[PDB]
From Swiss-Prot:
Modified residues (Phosphoserine): 1
UniProt-recorded name of the protein: Aldo-keto reductase family 1 member B1
Pfam families documented for this protein: Aldo_ket_red
Activity: how regulated: Cys-297 may regulate the kinetic and inhibition properties of the enzyme, but does not participate in catalysis. Tolrestat inhibits retinal reduction.
Reactions that this protein is recorded to catalyse: an alditol + NADP(+) = an aldose + NADPH + H(+); all-trans-retinol + NADP(+) = all-trans-retinal + NADPH + H(+); 9-cis-retinol + NADP(+) = 9-cis-retinal + NADPH + H(+); 13-cis-retinol + NADP(+) = 13-cis-retinal + NADPH + H(+)
Family to which this protein belongs: Belongs to the aldo/keto reductase family.
Active site: 47 (proton donor)
Positions that bind substrate: 109
Tissue-level expression: Highly expressed in embryonic epithelial cells (EUE) in response to osmotic stress.
InterPro entries: AKR, Aldo/ket_reductase_CS, NADP_OxRdtase_dom, NADP_OxRdtase_dom_sf
SUPFAM superfamilies xrefs: NAD(P)-linked oxidoreductase
Length: 314
């Protein structure tokens, strides 16, 4: 149920996603998740609900349902806080909202820095994102400091391409290697080269949007839909499992961590019932065959940012 990281800690391979979970619904979602066995929650300041996740964790610690050490809480540094002088503050805001005294894992959410300010997506008058003059290595150095101060137990990255990961690995005077790279991954974006790269470097990969993020705010009717894919439905029926369970089990069998999101109590429970079956070799082969290099998360207004990750092949 857990994978070993480079800091010696164990990370649950199944966690609960919280992007697009509205504040109060998310408090109940986390309480239910904890009750049915989730021990990893994936959070972010930019999801605007960390206080409400915090409420849930606090209450279940209080109810004596779980201990803090049994939980694996992840959050992420948003793009507008990449300046070295803003990182600790950003982390401490997350810690305050989550009502925690440490995070198990803290990620650089995206490799690009954005102009500091109240707005999470600062745009100019023609709709281009406004970058900041920050770079990956300086931001990484600031993340390292959080480990040395005890605010976070591990640090890692998200939406980094292999060249961007290499920049960190090859930093002279590197203090901590990235523990995790959290990237989009599902049957329509199978990430074979980046996953190979990362695993060969002892970096654990977490798959986000494993169900294809049907609630993403920029979905178009014509877009491919994983949960509705009749080929995957047929694989699921064969196992007497739902399509969602097949989609969650798939990355587990590639030695990935996976973080499906739900605020629907029955689905929260359903998505955790994935340790009692196995996809076969043919199933695995078939699911990888559906790759189309189709991305849920890739914001158009950021495509000219110096650090845009997805111009590179991988
Ligand atoms: N690091 C990054 O840049 C990044 C980017 C995107 C996502 N992520 C993380 O990854 C998580 C997962 O990605 P995601 O939120 O994009 O989408 P996802 O987990 O692929 O899909 C969530 C959508 O699927 C629905 N759903 C969940 N379980 C279902 C089931 N059993 N049957 C049918 N529908 C189901 C949910 O509906 P209800 O909630 O209404 O039940 C919601 O609409 C996020 O929440 C976030 O924590 C990280
Ligand atoms: O962020 C999430 O967890 C999900 C996520 N994804 N996207 C697509 C993005 N594409 C990006 C590209 C860059 C870039 F690095 F390329 F500049 C930087 C930042 C982004 S946000 C969003 O637009 C978004 C908006 C609010 C909350 C979460 C998200």
């Amino acid at each position: 149920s857990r994978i070993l990281l480079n800091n010696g800690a164990k990370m649950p391979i199944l966690g609960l996603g919280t992007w697009k979970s509205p504040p109060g619904q998310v408090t109940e979602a986390v309480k239910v998740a904890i009750d049915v066995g989730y021990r990893h929650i994936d959070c972010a300041h930019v999801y605007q609900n960390e206080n409400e996740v915090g409420v849930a964790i606090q209450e279940k610690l209080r109810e004596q349902v779980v201990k803090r050490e049994e939980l694996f809480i992840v959050s992420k540094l948003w793009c507008t806080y990449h300046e070295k002088g803003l990182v600790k503050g950003a982390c401490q805001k997350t810690l305050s909202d989550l009502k925690l005294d440490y995070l198990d894992l803290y990620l650089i959410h995206w490799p690009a820095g954005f102009k500091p300010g109240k707005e999470f997506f600062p745009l100019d008058e023609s709709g281009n994102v406004v970058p900041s003059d920050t770079n990956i290595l300086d931001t990484w150095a600031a993340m390292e400091e959080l480990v040395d101060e005890g605010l976070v137990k591990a640090i890692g990255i998200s939406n980094f391409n292999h060249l961007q990961v290499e920049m960190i690995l090859n930093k002279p005077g590197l203090k901590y290697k990235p523990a995790v790279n959290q990237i989009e991954c599902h049957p329509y974006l199978t990430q074979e080269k980046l996953i190979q790269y990362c695993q060969s470097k002892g970096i654990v990969v977490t798959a986000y949007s494993p169900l294809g993020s049907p609630d993403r705010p920029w979905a178009k009717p014509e877009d491919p839909s994983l949960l509705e894919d009749p080929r995957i439905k047929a694989i699921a029926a064969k196992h007497n499992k739902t399509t969602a369970q097949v989609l969650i089990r798939f990355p587990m069998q590639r030695n990935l961590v996976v973080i499906p999101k739900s605020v629907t109590p029955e689905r929260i429970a359903e998505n955790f019932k994935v340790f009692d079956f196995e996809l076969s070799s043919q199933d695995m082969t078939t699911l990888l065959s559906y790759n189309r290099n189709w991305r849920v998360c890739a914001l158009l207004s950021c495509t000219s940012h110096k650090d845009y990750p997805f111009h590179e092949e991988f």
